[PDB]
Amino acid sequence: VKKLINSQISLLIGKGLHEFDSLRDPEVNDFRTKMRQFCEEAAAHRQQLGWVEWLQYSFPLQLEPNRALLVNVKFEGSEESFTFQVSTKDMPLALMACALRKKATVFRQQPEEYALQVNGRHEYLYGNYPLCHFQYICSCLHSGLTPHLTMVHSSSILAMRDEQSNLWSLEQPFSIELIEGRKVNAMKLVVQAGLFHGNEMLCKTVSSSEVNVCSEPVWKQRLEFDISVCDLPRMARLCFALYAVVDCPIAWANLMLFDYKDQLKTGERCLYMWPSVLLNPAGTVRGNPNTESAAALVIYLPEVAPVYFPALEKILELGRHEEQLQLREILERELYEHEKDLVWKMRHEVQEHFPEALARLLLVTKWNKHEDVAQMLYLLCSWPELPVLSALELLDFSFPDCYVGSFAIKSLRKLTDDELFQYLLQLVQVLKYESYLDCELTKFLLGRALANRKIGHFLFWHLRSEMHVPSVALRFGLIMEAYCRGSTHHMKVLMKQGEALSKLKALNDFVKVSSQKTTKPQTKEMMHMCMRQETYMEALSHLQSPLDPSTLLEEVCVEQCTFMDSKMKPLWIMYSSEEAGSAGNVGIIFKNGDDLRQDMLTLQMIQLMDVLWKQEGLDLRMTPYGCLPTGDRTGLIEVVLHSDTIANIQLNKSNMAATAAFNKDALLNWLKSKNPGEALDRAIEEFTLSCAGYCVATYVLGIGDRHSDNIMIRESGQLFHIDFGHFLGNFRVPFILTYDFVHVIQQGKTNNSEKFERFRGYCERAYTILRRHGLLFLHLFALMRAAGLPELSCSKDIQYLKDSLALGKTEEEALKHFRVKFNEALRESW
Ligand SMILES: Cn1nc(-c2cnc(N)c(-n3ccc(C(N)=O)n3)n2)nc1C1(c2ccccc2)CC1
């Protein structure tokens, strides 16, 4: 049983558990055991949870960020149902009470003993919330559809639970012995070495002597740093760069000066270097696992004798020891040395009256002076809990201190499961900045994953998608193993998704081959013939959607499956569910060959924009569809059904009802056929609302190469963008407006200023709302720099956001510049 589970984790994570053992690494073995226990403790707490608490784990509530409606209800072991006319203001309890009353009359004779399952979905309705606060109810109030729900008794949820169980004394300078190399280049070799605490140098970067190019260069040179051994901060990083000069970079490598047990390192170290794109402080402190092709830098850390980093009780003991200022008020809304001295002097007054300025003072503390650090740490240890927004900033590489990091985690505990889900992608990326395997962020990510099955799901996939990346393969694999130990049943549920994805990779490889060799109907027929095989039928059916674990992908609709003509021949896979009805008619797009990490970020940023607008009582009818990277240049996209491209509608194909005399009318003619009579006016308003949100979103995010093939419309009138290959103006893009879209907004009239001026106001509002949250976008995109995205490489990518959101300016200057940008787009629109 314990063996099968081990062989199951190895297959699921993609790395044999034997590989973790073969390292003989005390750091790896300590994490594995400690985390396993932590995760088994979390699995044990789950089985003693009440049946409602376990519903909150397995099926977290999908909520929205007077008017009656039909609702169809049935009980678990029966085909018999009942349709009620309930209210949107009614709680699930009133609905369940009605449902029990109808059962009593029919069966000829307690609501609190039940929960309402969404038919053929892992989504439930419970809690003291009116029906219109539920995402599903709204997914029915807008599509016009009738909600279908099932009464599930407490004992039936408890049957589910059960089946789902398992020092300051050393004032001498820091120096090293640079022994030799084992590399390749075309010229002389030089080694640059620097000591860092995050983004900043602790002292000036020291260089090596020029040694002539060869495969095994020798230096045996002592490199001395302008810093005392007693002044090395705990998270100090000794960074190396190997380059060939007459400059040409070759390789880089980093290492922490203290180990995971806080002991200062001695003596011989062999550094398996990483290929270069000069000094890279942000890069991994673990050497290249490719010890066969990797260049190796041999160094010696000289013995100073065992020296451990002083415990917090020693740091604290040390640390304890005019109206003109502020002054510091005016610089607290990127500063000179005199202003940094002001902040350091005022450090106590910052804790007292500006706790949120913690990040500004953390940047001014002299981390290369052990007494200056202790003083900061004494203040930090009494520092009030910071807001989530300020805490998100402290996760950055600019704040590498472990005590700062621990303080940031302590402040993100108050994060709701909804807020955590929204920023889960960025928190996972921050793991790349981590210096040790055992960290507060891993423990936080795991603890929250094991207490919420949806968080658990996405933590797994974010990590699993990066297993082909050698710099994060050990960390991510170890975290996923610890997770699986905390959820044996979820492990198998995820295995079912990997098996389905394995079949789609094999199926898509054939589609790629066949498309270059025969006609599309010939390829489609054999794709279908291959799908109908027992192993493909078994693997592609009855799984949880990796895009949303609450979507149940039941029976695969082979006849409705196809592939798109684009570069990578993406697979279009359709599913159906008898039990779910129309909610079970769901599609997935399997794309293989492109990097979907950016597309996901872009879709997540739009999803956030929609959330923020909804918070301010604005629903700009956005379509933030799923996009999940699953593997190496592999992922899934959610099919937005009953939609088509602008190019397909505008292609003006004959015989159809959408036939237009003029191109400008093609969109409005298509909407007239999909929404006839009284339904048209509703479609136009959906179009206008969705158009305004995407106008602002694409402008703020700087989305370029926008044509009729990457813009879509739902039959409801809602416009949305697809295929986000590029963002942040990276090929300063303007605001975009189209005459044919402006035509739909103006009701199909050449002149209709009342409709266009309403539209212009939507664009202004949406923009002004996002501007207030401009710092959230800044912090989240700054965190996303860790990912390794070519279009989010530096500060010049972060700058696009600053300018698109006009963050340095006031609202009146920003709204004027937006009015200038909107009119520039209108004049350009013919
Ligand atoms: C009817 N339909 N619906 C879609 C659609 C829906 N939802 C999406 N998310 C999406 N999509 C595509 C690529 C990306 C992306 N994010 O990269 N997103 N496409 N596409 C089609 C057409 C189609 C389908 C299948 C075969 C031929 C032709 C073109 C008509």
DSSP 197-211: ETTEESSPPEEPPPE
Residue nearest ligand 1's atom 8 by CA: 639
553 CB-near residues (< 8 Å, 6+ apart): 500, 541, 542, 543, 544, 545, 575, 586, 588
In this structure, which amino acid lies at residue 559? E
> Which three-class secondary structure state does DSSP give residue 111?
helix
Q: Is 415 in the pocket of ligand 1 (CB under 6 A)?
A: no
Q: Bridge partners of 631?
A: 634
> Which three-class secondary structure state does DSSP give residue 347?
helix
Largest CA distance in the chain: 97
Q: Token pair of 455, please?
A: 């968080």
Ligand 1 atom at minimum distance from 599 CA: 16
Identify the residue whose tokens are 């190496």: 632
CA trace torsion 572, 577, 583, 585 (10° rounding): 30
In this structure, which amino acid lies at residue 784? M
Neighbours of 219 (CB within 10 A): 20
Side-chain half-sphere of 156: how many Cα atoms within 13 Å? 12
In this structure, which amino acid lies at residue 691? C
Q: Is 564 in the pocket of ligand 1 (CB under 6 A)?
A: yes
CA 591 to centroid of ligand 1, rounded, Å: 11
CA 253 to centroid of ligand 1, rounded, Å: 43
- Containing 638, the helix (H) or strand (E) segment is strand 634-638
Q: Which of 829, 674, 680 is nearest to 747 (CA)?
A: 680
Q: Please check whether residue 289 is in contact with residue 473, taking contact to mean a CB–CB distance below 8 angstroms.
A: yes
- Containing 694, the helix (H) or strand (E) segment is helix 680-701
In this structure, which amino acid lies at residue 102? K
Q: Is 527 in the pocket of ligand 1 (CB under 6 A)?
A: no
* Alpha carbon separation from 824 to 746, 784, 821 (Å, rounded): 19, 31, 5
How far apart, in whole angstroms, are the C-alpha atoms of residue 744 and residue 660? 14
Q: Bridge partners of 450?
A: none
β-pairing, 571-577 vs 581-592, is: antiparallel
Residue 453, Ramachandran bin (φ over 0: left; ψ between -120 and 50: alpha; else beta): alpha
Experimental determination technique: X-ray
Residue nearest ligand 1's atom 22 by CA: 644
425 CB-near residues (< 8 Å, 6+ apart): 462, 600, 601, 604, 784
Could you write out the three-class secondary structure of 131-165? HHHEHHHHHHHCCCCCCEEEEEEHHHHHHHHHHCC
**Helix-helix angle 753-772:597-615, to 10 degrees:** 100
- Containing 391, the helix (H) or strand (E) segment is helix 388-393
How far apart, in whole angstroms, are the C-alpha atoms of residue 584 and residue 599? 25
How far apart, in whole angstroms, are the C-alpha atoms of residue 587 and residue 283? 39
Q: CB burial class (10 A; 0-12, 13-18, 19+) of residue 118? A: buried
User: How far is C-alpha 498 from the geometric centre of its chain's CA atoms?
Assistant: 20
The span from the first CA to the last CA of the chain, in angstroms, equals 70
Ligand 1 pocket test, pick from 637, 648, 694, 723 with the greatest ligand atom count within 8 Å of Cβ, gives: 637
How far apart, in whole angstroms, are the C-alpha atoms of residue 724 and residue 601? 9
How far apart, in whole angstroms, are the C-alpha atoms of residue 601 and residue 607? 10
Residue nearest ligand 1's atom 23 by CA: 564
How far apart, in whole angstroms, are the C-alpha atoms of residue 663 and residue 686? 21
Neighbours of 392 (CB within 10 A): 25
Q: Bridge partners of 72?
A: 83, 148
* Alpha carbon separation from 440 to 42, 254, 405, 406, 482 (Å, rounded): 16, 22, 8, 6, 14
181 CB-near residues (< 8 Å, 6+ apart): 189, 216, 217, 218, 219, 242, 295, 296, 297, 298
CA 586 to centroid of ligand 1, rounded, Å: 13
> Which three-class secondary structure state does DSSP give residue 557?
coil
Q: Please check whether residue 22 is in contact with residue 501, taking contact to mean a CB–CB distance below 8 angstroms.
A: no
Q: What is the DSSP letter of 385?
A: P
Q: Please check whether residue 253 is in contact with residue 272, taking contact to mean a CB–CB distance below 8 angstroms.
A: yes
How far apart, in whole angstroms, are the C-alpha atoms of residue 743 and residue 412? 47
Q: Is 568 in the pocket of ligand 1 (CB under 6 A)?
A: no
Could you write out the three-class secondary structure of 644-683? EEHHHHHCCCCCCCCCCCCHHHHHHHHHHHHCCHHHHHHH
**What are the DSSP E strand ranges found in 77-147?**
81-87, 114-118, 124-125
Q: Please check whether residue 724 is in contact with residue 702, taking contact to mean a CB–CB distance below 8 angstroms.
A: no
Q: Bridge partners of 149?
A: 73, 118
Residue 805, Ramachandran bin (φ over 0: left; ψ between -120 and 50: alpha; else beta): alpha
How far apart, in whole angstroms, are the C-alpha atoms of residue 809 and residue 802? 10
Q: Please check whether residue 450 is in contact with residue 487, taking contact to mean a CB–CB distance below 8 angstroms.
A: yes
How far apart, in whole angstroms, are the C-alpha atoms of residue 702 and residue 700? 5
CA 743 to centroid of ligand 1, rounded, Å: 25
> Which three-class secondary structure state does DSSP give residue 237?
strand
How far apart, in whole angstroms, are the C-alpha atoms of residue 65 and residue 425? 19
> Which three-class secondary structure state does DSSP give residue 741?
helix
Q: Is 763 in the pocket of ligand 1 (CB under 6 A)?
A: no
* Alpha carbon separation from 216 to 183, 242, 245, 301 (Å, rounded): 6, 13, 17, 20
How far apart, in whole angstroms, are the C-alpha atoms of residue 830 and residue 828? 6
Q: Token pair of 799, please?
A: 């700058």
β-pairing, 211-212 vs 188-197, is: antiparallel
Ligand 1 atom at minimum distance from 638 CA: 9
Q: Is 640 in the pocket of ligand 1 (CB under 6 A)?
A: yes
CA 333 to centroid of ligand 1, rounded, Å: 45
Ligand 1 pocket test, pick from 561, 571, 639, 727 with the greatest ligand atom count within 8 Å of Cβ, gives: 639
Q: Token pair of 144, please?
A: 């016009």
Identify the residue whose tokens are 């020693």: 314
Q: Is 424 in the pocket of ligand 1 (CB under 6 A)?
A: no
How far apart, in whole angstroms, are the C-alpha atoms of residue 552 and residue 191? 56
Q: Is 40 in the pocket of ligand 1 (CB under 6 A)?
A: no
Q: Which of 221, 229, 228 is nearest to 192 (CA)?
A: 221
- Containing 422, the helix (H) or strand (E) segment is helix 417-430
264 CB-near residues (< 8 Å, 6+ apart): 229, 232, 257, 258, 304, 307, 308, 309
How far apart, in whole angstroms, are the C-alpha atoms of residue 592 and residue 598? 15
How far apart, in whole angstroms, are the C-alpha atoms of residue 205 and residue 203? 7
Ligand 1 atom at minimum distance from 639 CA: 7
Residue nearest ligand 1's atom 24 by CA: 564
How far apart, in whole angstroms, are the C-alpha atoms of residue 136 and residue 62? 8
In this structure, which amino acid lies at residue 10? S
How far apart, in whole angstroms, are the C-alpha atoms of residue 113 and residue 154? 5
Q: Please check whether residue 506 is in contact with residue 498, taking contact to mean a CB–CB distance below 8 angstroms.
A: no
Ligand 1 pocket test, pick from 560, 568, 640 with the greatest ligand atom count within 8 Å of Cβ, gives: 640
How far apart, in whole angstroms, are the C-alpha atoms of residue 606 and residue 695? 11
Q: Please check whether residue 480 is in contact with residue 464, taking contact to mean a CB–CB distance below 8 angstroms.
A: yes
Q: CB burial class (10 A; 0-12, 13-18, 19+) of residue 616? A: middle
How far apart, in whole angstroms, are the C-alpha atoms of residue 72 and residue 148? 5
How far apart, in whole angstroms, are the C-alpha atoms of residue 52 and residue 155? 11
**What are the DSSP E strand ranges found in 497-633?**
543-545, 548-553, 555-556, 562-563, 571-577, 581-592, 627-631
Q: Token pair of 584, please?
A: 């079970």
Q: Please check whether residue 241 is in contact with residue 280, taking contact to mean a CB–CB distance below 8 angstroms.
A: yes
Ligand 1 atom at minimum distance from 562 CA: 26
Q: Please check whether residue 240 is in contact with residue 254, taking contact to mean a CB–CB distance below 8 angstroms.
A: yes
How far apart, in whole angstroms, are the C-alpha atoms of residue 445 and residue 439? 10
How far apart, in whole angstroms, are the C-alpha atoms of residue 93 and residue 86? 12
How far apart, in whole angstroms, are the C-alpha atoms of residue 554 and residue 599? 27
* Alpha carbon separation from 595 to 233, 633, 720 (Å, rounded): 38, 5, 21
Q: Bridge partners of 191?
A: 242
* Reported resolution, Å: 2.5
How far apart, in whole angstroms, are the C-alpha atoms of residue 41 and residue 23? 27
Q: Please check whether residue 775 is in contact with residue 781, taking contact to mean a CB–CB distance below 8 angstroms.
A: no
> Which three-class secondary structure state does DSSP give residue 112?
helix
Phi/psi at 510 (5° precision): -65, -45
In this structure, which amino acid lies at residue 398? S
Residue nearest ligand 1's atom 17 by CA: 723
Q: Please check whether residue 721 is in contact with residue 624, taking contact to mean a CB–CB distance below 8 angstroms.
A: no
Q: Which of 643, 647, 517, 535 is nearest to 589 (CA)?
A: 643
Ligand 1 pocket test, pick from 712, 720, 723, 726 with the greatest ligand atom count within 8 Å of Cβ, gives: 712
Q: Please check whether residue 190 is in contact with residue 212, taking contact to mean a CB–CB distance below 8 angstroms.
A: no
